[PDB]
Paper text:
The [name] tumor suppressor protein is a transcription factor that, upon cellular stress, is stabilized and activates a transcriptional program, inhibiting cell division and initiating DNA repair. Although other genetic alterations exist, the majority of [name] mutations result from a single-base alteration (missense mutation), with most residing within the DNA binding domain (DBD) of [name], which binds selectively to the [name] response element. The [name] [name] mutation ([name] c.659A>G, p.Tyr220Cys, p.[name]) is present in approximately 1% of all solid tumors. This single amino acid substitution creates a small pocket in the [name] protein, making it thermodynamically unstable at physiologic temperatures and unable to interact with and bind to DNA effectively.
To facilitate further design, PC10709 was cocrystallized with the [name]-DBD. The crystal structure of PC10709 complexed with the [name]-mutant [name] protein was solved at 1.90 Å resolution. The [name]-mutant [name] protein used for X-ray crystallization analysis consists of the DBD spanning amino acids 94 to 312, which was stabilized by four additional mutations (M133L, V203A, N239Y, and N268D) without any effect on the DNA-binding defect of the [name] mutation. The X-ray structure confirmed that PC10709 binds within the crevice created by the tyrosine-to-cysteine substitution, with the indole moiety occupying this space and the trifluoromethyl group extending deep into the hydrophobic pocket. The 4-aminopiperidine ring extends toward the solvent, and the alkyne linker reaches the adjacent subsite. This allows for favorable CH–π stacking interaction of the aromatic ring with Pro-153. Two critical hydrogen bonding interactions involving the [name]-[name] DBD and PC10709 were observed: one interaction with the carbonyl of Cys-220 and another with the side chain of Thr-150. Based on the analysis of the binding mode, introducing a fluorine substitution on the piperidine ring could enhance hydrogen bonding with Thr-150, increase the conformational rigidity of the piperidine ring, and reduce basicity. These modifications were incorporated into compounds PC14374 and PC14586, significantly improving potency and pharmacokinetic exposure.
Residue numbers in the entry: 95 to 291
The structure:
Amino acid sequence: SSVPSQKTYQGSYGFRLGFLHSGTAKSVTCTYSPALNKLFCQLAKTCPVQLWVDSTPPPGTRVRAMAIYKQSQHMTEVVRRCPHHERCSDSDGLAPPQHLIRVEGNLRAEYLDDRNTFRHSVVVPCEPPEVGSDCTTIHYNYMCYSSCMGGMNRRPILTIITLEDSSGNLLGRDSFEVRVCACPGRDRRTEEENLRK
Ligand SMILES: COc1cc(S(C)(=O)=O)ccc1NCC#Cc1cc2c(NC3CCN(C)CC3)cccc2n1CC(F)(F)F
Ligand SMILES: [Zn+2]
């Protein structure tokens, strides 16, 4: 399949992502490593992702998420849920059972099967921050473990976040690596310790 770009692009509105500072306690359900540009999360749990701009884009702007394999030899393969999880009948009514990334808590979420590339994505409208807030937040859920055999199969993925106009034209792009695992805090600590060597 075709290769979606992963190149960081702030664009005219100064678009970029932000993450909470959740620490690495054993109980943490989602945690982000700036040093690794890597989000560690548990299966089907809330992953807050912040959206930052220097200036407000137009009404009708949307934000899309898509997963791609990070390694060169796998990037052309569609990232999808594994044979077990795509058959477990756990759709919320919007997400197709094959889709790895869901949006939590937004009834306006839309799911795309690309007719040409067969890649999956989920897109929502974006709005300015609530009163007293400086950014907006999307809550994502990842619906397979990184280790799921016949799906990601222990291969690392990136999530590409794109800011789009109402026609789908590119306004901005950012990305981060993702590991979906049972203990994100320990795994982040381990991978950051490995980095220190
Ligand atoms: C129904 O939706 C809309 C309605 C209107 S409106 C009521 O004027 O009719 C206008 C726009 C939209 N929607 C598109 C959007 C947006 C947006 C603005 C934004 C943001 N603003 C600050 C504002 C202050 N200055 C100094 C820095 C920038 C800070 C952080 C995130 C922000 N976002 C979301 C993002 F990042 F994804 F683009
Ligand atoms: Zn799975």
